[PDB]
């Protein structure tokens, strides 16, 4: 159970992933049975293959990047919550989208669960 300094690390390494596009690394962060409720309200996606699936939906096309826009919080118990920017390409019309990120990690240093907090309103042009 990863301490909050490593919630920190593990979180902004999340970030950097996702950033470059790499698929088979972000996976490989999530526990074998993690959950992923993206945007949250929707219904959570379970298991390796469809975690895989929603990643390569959302970042095969290469061009998408991202960062955070402030620090990581981190709690003792395993959990984090970070606020990041989206940067993505419908039509060739670049837009951003301002996401808040929250995971508990498992007694493995895995995720858990994850729940991206997003909707319309946080999406601009």
Not at 23 to 44: C, H, K, N, R, S
Not at 63 to 71: D, E, H, M
Not at 97 to 106: E, G, K, P, Q
């Amino acid at each position: 159970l990863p301490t909050a300094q490593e919630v920190q690390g593990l979180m902004a390494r999340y970030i950097e992933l996702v950033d470059v596009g790499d698929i088979e690394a972000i996976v490989q962060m999530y526990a074998d049975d993690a959950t992923v409720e993206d945007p949250f309200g929707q219904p959570p996606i379970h298991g390796r293959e469809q975690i895989a699936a929603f990643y390569r939906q959302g970042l095969g096309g290469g061009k998408v990047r991202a960062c955070l826009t402030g620090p990581v919080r981190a709690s003792h118990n395993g959990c984090g919550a970070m606020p990041f920017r989206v940067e993505m390409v419908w039509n060739g019309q670049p837009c951003a989208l301002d996401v808040i990120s929250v995971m508990r990690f498992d007694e493995h240093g895995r995720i858990q669960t994850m729940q991206a907090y997003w909707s319309e309103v946080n999406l601009s042009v």
